[PDB]
A paper describes a structure:
[name] ([name]) participates in the elongation of early autophagosomal structures in concert with Atg2 and Atg9 complexes. The autophagic membrane adapter [name] reveals an unexpected structural plasticity in multiple modes of oligomeric organization.
To further investigate the binding mode of [name] to lipid membranes, we mixed soluble [name] with PI3,5P2-doped large unilamellar vesicles (LUVs). When membranes are aligned in parallel, we found connecting density that we interpreted as [name] bridging two juxtaposed bilayers. The inter-membrane distance in the [name]-WT and [name] s-loop samples was constant over parallel membrane stretches and very similar at ~80 Å, respectively, whereas no consistent inter-membrane spacing could be detected between undecorated 100% DOPC liposomes without [name]. In the density, we found [name] molecules in four pairs of dimers with a slightly twisted interface matching the observed I-interface of the tubular [name] assembly determined above. Notably in the cryo-EM density, the basic [name] dimer unit was found to assume a 45° tilt angle with respect to both membrane planes, which could be independently confirmed by measurements in raw tomogram slices. The fitted [name] dimers lack the interaction through the T-interface due to PIP-binding.
Numbering used by the authors:
A (entry chain F), D (entry chain D), E (entry chain B): 5 to 65, 70 to 156, 222 to 321, 409 to 445, 458 to 500
B (entry chain E), C (entry chain C), F (entry chain A): 5 to 65, 70 to 156, 222 to 321, 409 to 445, 458 to 499
Amino acid sequence: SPTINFINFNQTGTCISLGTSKGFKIFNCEPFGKFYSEDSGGYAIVEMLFSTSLLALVGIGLSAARLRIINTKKHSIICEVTFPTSILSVKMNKSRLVVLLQEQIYIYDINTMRLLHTIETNPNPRGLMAMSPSVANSYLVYPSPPKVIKNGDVIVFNLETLQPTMVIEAHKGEIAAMAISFDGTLMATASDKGTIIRVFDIETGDKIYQFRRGTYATRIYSISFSEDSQYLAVTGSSKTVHIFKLGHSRHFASLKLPVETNSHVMTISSIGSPIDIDTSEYPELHEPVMKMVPIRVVSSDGYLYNFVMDPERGGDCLILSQYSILMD
Amino acid sequence: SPTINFINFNQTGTCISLGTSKGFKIFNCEPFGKFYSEDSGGYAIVEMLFSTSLLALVGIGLSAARLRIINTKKHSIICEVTFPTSILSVKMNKSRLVVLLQEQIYIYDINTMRLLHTIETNPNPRGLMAMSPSVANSYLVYPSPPKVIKNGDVIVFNLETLQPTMVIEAHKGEIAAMAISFDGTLMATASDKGTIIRVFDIETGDKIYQFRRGTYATRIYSISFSEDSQYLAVTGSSKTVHIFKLGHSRHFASLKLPVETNSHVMTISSIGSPIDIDTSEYPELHEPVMKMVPIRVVSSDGYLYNFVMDPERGGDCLILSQYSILM
Amino acid sequence: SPTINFINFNQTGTCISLGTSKGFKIFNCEPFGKFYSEDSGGYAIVEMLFSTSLLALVGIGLSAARLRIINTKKHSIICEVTFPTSILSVKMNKSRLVVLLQEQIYIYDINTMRLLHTIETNPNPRGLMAMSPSVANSYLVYPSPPKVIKNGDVIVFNLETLQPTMVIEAHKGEIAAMAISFDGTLMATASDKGTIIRVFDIETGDKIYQFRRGTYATRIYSISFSEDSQYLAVTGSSKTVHIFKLGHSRHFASLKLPVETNSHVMTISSIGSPIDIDTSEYPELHEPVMKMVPIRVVSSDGYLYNFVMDPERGGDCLILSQYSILM
Amino acid sequence: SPTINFINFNQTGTCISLGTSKGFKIFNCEPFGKFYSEDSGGYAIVEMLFSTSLLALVGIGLSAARLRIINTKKHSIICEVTFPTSILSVKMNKSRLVVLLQEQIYIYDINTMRLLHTIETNPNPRGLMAMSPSVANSYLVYPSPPKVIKNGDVIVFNLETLQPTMVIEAHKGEIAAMAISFDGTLMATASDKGTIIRVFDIETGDKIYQFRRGTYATRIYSISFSEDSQYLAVTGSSKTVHIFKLGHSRHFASLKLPVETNSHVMTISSIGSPIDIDTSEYPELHEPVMKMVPIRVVSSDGYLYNFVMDPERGGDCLILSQYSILMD
Amino acid sequence: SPTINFINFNQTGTCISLGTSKGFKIFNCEPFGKFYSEDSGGYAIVEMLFSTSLLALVGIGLSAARLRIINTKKHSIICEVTFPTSILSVKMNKSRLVVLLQEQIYIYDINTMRLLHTIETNPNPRGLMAMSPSVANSYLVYPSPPKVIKNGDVIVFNLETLQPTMVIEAHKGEIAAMAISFDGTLMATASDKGTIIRVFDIETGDKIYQFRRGTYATRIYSISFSEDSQYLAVTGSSKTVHIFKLGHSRHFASLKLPVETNSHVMTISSIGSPIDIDTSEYPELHEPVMKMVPIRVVSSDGYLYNFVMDPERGGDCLILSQYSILMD
Amino acid sequence: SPTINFINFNQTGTCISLGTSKGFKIFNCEPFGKFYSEDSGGYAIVEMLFSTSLLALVGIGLSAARLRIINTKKHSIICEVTFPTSILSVKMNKSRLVVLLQEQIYIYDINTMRLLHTIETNPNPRGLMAMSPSVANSYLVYPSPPKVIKNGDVIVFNLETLQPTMVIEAHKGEIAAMAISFDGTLMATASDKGTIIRVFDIETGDKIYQFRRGTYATRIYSISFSEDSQYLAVTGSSKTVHIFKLGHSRHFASLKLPVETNSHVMTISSIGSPIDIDTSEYPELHEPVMKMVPIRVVSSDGYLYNFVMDPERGGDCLILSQYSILM
């Protein structure tokens, strides 16, 4: 079993991207299957648009500096761009392409592929970003630490006009994770303590929600919004996933992975639109069918976990199935 | 009489820097005199610190891109730095040195002279900034127009920590002039129409005062605060200089230059601390001495004009004397 | 005594430019003196125009690629230009500026300083050119070897119209030195063996004179014409300088340096206009005064040697005096 | 009927290339037929080697900047090279490939396809070139106008050693057309007046022949040598084609197109080796067969015209047939 | 090493055709080399004309019923013709193309490719044929067994006029092999016993020569004439090749394959025009050079064997070299 | 009186088959009578076996392509078979059934009626064959002209083994009529000019006899042998029937029809075994009885003519009686 270095959902959560030390893979979620694969070499960043057969490939070191965009349906190379330093993150929408280095931000137009704007930012060794995926509210946010309490400063940058809009005084400590909703309305961040989750409304700048996560300080791996902006997902080193309800404190519902899973695994999750499931097959503990929110949690060990959450009851979520990436 | 391309006061307003097409000169204000001069070449930017024998010299194009730092007392060269494009503005405090190109901002430590930060901004063909001269509140502000209504966006940048603090939605149109008080507390901005003057409190961001300037729209050359932040001075193409009182609308007092003066003159001004003047010599229209704020207005034609303002009466200001720079 | 890396006369031969590992110096010839000097850094190319306080300064590697134009009277910088590779030669007239890299030629207008033309040539590791200093016949010639017998092909390029005029099949072997007279009428070339010196008439292209140099093949350092195109001076590794008379084969007159001189010295020379010298002081072997052509030969060890040639007698030339540059 | 933008014979004159706004076509001459076609898009330059299934494709704007080499028999792409500006001409021999922009010349080796030499020339908005098609005498000539009487300067460049050989003082006015014989021995040029045709011997530089063309000044569209260097063909805006005999003034023989043809049409021609025709079928006005020089003249309207010339009589040439390109 | 299903010389013996289960190959004989190849699939019949880049391809099952004619130089398909049953043999000359099924004969004109004549013959499971390759004497002969001693009846069919010419009472038993000389003058046949070889003159019908082959009855694989009609070659299951002289019984000269070769291999041979060889290199056991008849024997295992025969001495033939088909 | 399209004897010559445009009829020869008749439709081919109540019926176009086998005694249908084109000839023996189209020959087993063989021949628009009626020597012969001098090539085909035996180069011109004796021993052929009659021995292939017919070339309608192969009968457009004696040139005996007969009549004949006739009734010009070979000649106009030939005298033959078929 080859080691994997990167997992990432698309901007809608209906697909899967992945990068191994021997190649990369592209899966699908509802009619599960291996859509694409290529065993060329180690890949560290595999980012794709809303399907559309568009990919962004960063080699593990094709070095980590070079970024290559490949159209999988045409099997051709759109362009290749090099960078002075290793790439730390690449994110995309159907309007702009952004490449982030440790102290610089590069912004490209996805169509023309010509360089547009460059931001000189204070060092970000963690490669933290968040991009609104919609063109109507195209906003990019990056942290602004002081150069050596005013450490958790985040710069709200509008990609449409290529000018900053405001400065958000997010937290006292360094930012550890950040995400933007699908429509670009909201924003969520968390310090390196992972104890307090804060939600700011990007257009006005007001803090809307403040959630407490866990009891003691522990690392946060990633944050992701629901597609309908109803729920927010956080994953940490405690091998537990929390879901906070944004329909408005304590986490609304929690996901516990199977015990056999090792605790030293990074997990990214995604929340999908509610679906109907047959209660006859699953003794939830009854109407024949009731709406269940499906949750997909994939870990760096190469597994996929499917949960269902009751929007009213919440609580601990039942687990339906456990596929295995890199195999059937 | 050689043509002059650049005039500015020092950060305290007690000195004069000037650049001709043949060299640069340095003057003084109260015991007027010519401290230094060199007939080296064309100079476009001659900026000085709080005396201290430190200068920034930019050639007319010594190219326009090159910047040279010279100690006038030692007649030596501290350093020499080049830039890919022509320099548009240079400002200093006793802690940081800022060089602005049309699209880039370079910040240097005044002591070590090593580069500290670089800012990629939207193009500024007008070379507009404002630098707080005090190290306690060292702030830099530069405009951020959208790249091709929200055209008059300005970025409040902190030099101490090298991180921006906030974004101020100053005006609807493009910014034309910026000025920061001596202590770095306030910032004043002017749109390209020069009809509304707005001053913001830099730490909070709230607009404190709003001034109406003149009757019709006309260009603004420069803005400058008083040492004690009591008054604000603006000069425009109407050949008239206005003084706005910040002790708290309409201009408090107006400076009318002599009629024979050319109308197409760049005019910069400065406000000094109140001093005692004898009313026996000057029929102000009476106690023997009364405090009157002295104002120095140097124009691009090469003349200095001294005025006095009565802080209570205000109104049209009397002119005492006129020298002639370059002579 | 710092090492020196570059010596050349001006386009009239009445001045000296020189570059050390610590700075550059500028001298004069008839009333000998040191006009200028700076201990800035290593300089590899120091080229001057017809006095006029204009210089081209190239750092030893200020990198070798960078070229800086400095006005010594104003102590300012006209401009600063970089190149992808190290500069190999720089020459000027009062109309054009030429910068040569190993495979590229850049031509600049001396006044506006904007780029005018670029020539892609076959590699020239020796950095060889020749520039006519008069604007009436402004010509540039550079060698064009085949890219890997016809190896000594040289391209006659007109700077005025920026179009080549003709191709001269100069020599069978690679070109080693090129020189153009003051008026731009003639061009002289030297093969890598230094045995045959050929001069061509640039407008017609016909070889006018052919000179045999020395007895055996040896390297040639530089060639230079007289102001009136009467004589041609070549210097080689044999520590001997030859003068060929163009008033029309064998060298007309030979310059033998003092024996104590090191043999491994780069030697450049120049020929000046005839002057009156007193035979009473100098027993030439007699009228009190007779015109004798003065020759100045500066070597890489740092010394200047003054000779005189009798235009009718020719022959071995007497040496009058010796100074010491850098002292 | 789609509009066509480019017509060009091969280096031997036994084939035809063509480019439309919808695709390109490749014909043949003696056993006439449509050898190849591809309706991809607009093409502006279609240049091919001596058969050998080698092509050079320049899109109308595959932009005009990009040049693509396609092997029609293998249906694959050998390589793709981009250029900063739009391409104005591409010519080839079995040794070198040259791409010309408005102020630059690029020279490539046809086999290795690596860049060899670059010439910085004065602006040529007309895209004028001439290449000897034989490797024994590989010479390339381009005009050298002054940069703003010495306007008609042409630089004779040897492609083998990549060094200029001489400078030719061709004409007083700007050069309008130029061509090189098959063996690379001769050269022919004409100013923008089109009144005087001059022939220079490329190896020595001497002007060998000087022909007068027409009476009043009129534009010249193209010049082409005969394969055996016996005759030279010029075509102008007068809807008339002249042939000058090089076996050595006034044009030896002239070709008049049918009256129905519009005068605002560009025509390129080619001269083939002499062939035997039966005088019984054609009342020339008699031996049964006598040698006739065949001439093929194709116009931008999409037609082909076949003429026969008597090398001794010359004069106005009889027209045998009139095919139609884009159809049968 | 892929298995091969078909080997056949051309009508002159100067080339080689071959068909594998993965593709087909085309070799050459005197300047030995691999002229062509194509790894598409299994091929059972690969027949080619006198060079001329013409091929006949029958798939192993492109089924065995379908026959496809491909021009290897043009890489195109001339035509495709289907048949109700599997093809058993295809032979060609520069005038006619004949396709044989188990009970039917189809004759086509090679140029026009339209059907001309069809012969309804009694069943021939062995696919036996013989065609004169010259247009002057275009004769086709096929066996005519009785439908269930008069079993070895062969019908002499003239392809030019498409009418039978005579009936030959060849042998008492079933015919096993048959061949026609290059000029179409002679004919040779052999029964399934392989003991007696009979030669009939096709124009008159008289039996000219009768040769005894071997001692006991054994199978005969193929018969081939010399180009000059001087010698006749037979190959059997005894791993031995006999040559009978037609300059006029017992075989004149015999060819013994190397012992390492397996006996269960089918061998086809061909006789070429006499050539000069240097006796200095080869100690034949002496003039420096003497004429030797070269013989090429290829077996179904994938090897080629070159022999030399002395026309006067005959006897056992020396073997010069042993190439290897499917490799160098 | 309906038109008649087809007349032929049986394989023994003791019966008559006939086809009208309204139906078919079957007669007898020695005790003359009408055995059978049906007014069904137009019939073009009515062929019978050796009595045995077996018939082959082809419609006039029951299309011309269709063939129907009918048993007249049972009034039933044995089978029905169609063909892609119109049938041109049908013949039988007691072992095989042959159907000929213009370019194809079909052979059927008379008993099982399953198809046995098919022959692809060059086109025969005249529908010519010859069938041996004995199973001991069952042979079929059909012409093989070249497909567009050797035009009269005929193929000897053996029905028993279904394989051809030999090819006979019969005549230079196209074959016009073929006939095989009762035992299948001999075959007779006639060219389109009808001048030369050739008979070949089918087993050996050698031409045995050659007969000259008439004086000038004229068409031949049919040929038929005697039962004992003693005589051969040919009928042509000259309204004269010739008898050639094969007991071994010029015709042995000639049959002249009555003058009133139409000249444009298809005439077929047959030769029977010798019988005893009374010379008292017939003045032959005498023993009371002498054997005379009876000849029956039925013509397309619908009449039967009875002749007698003296085997020794030969010569012109006397006519005894005339009936009228269809009445």
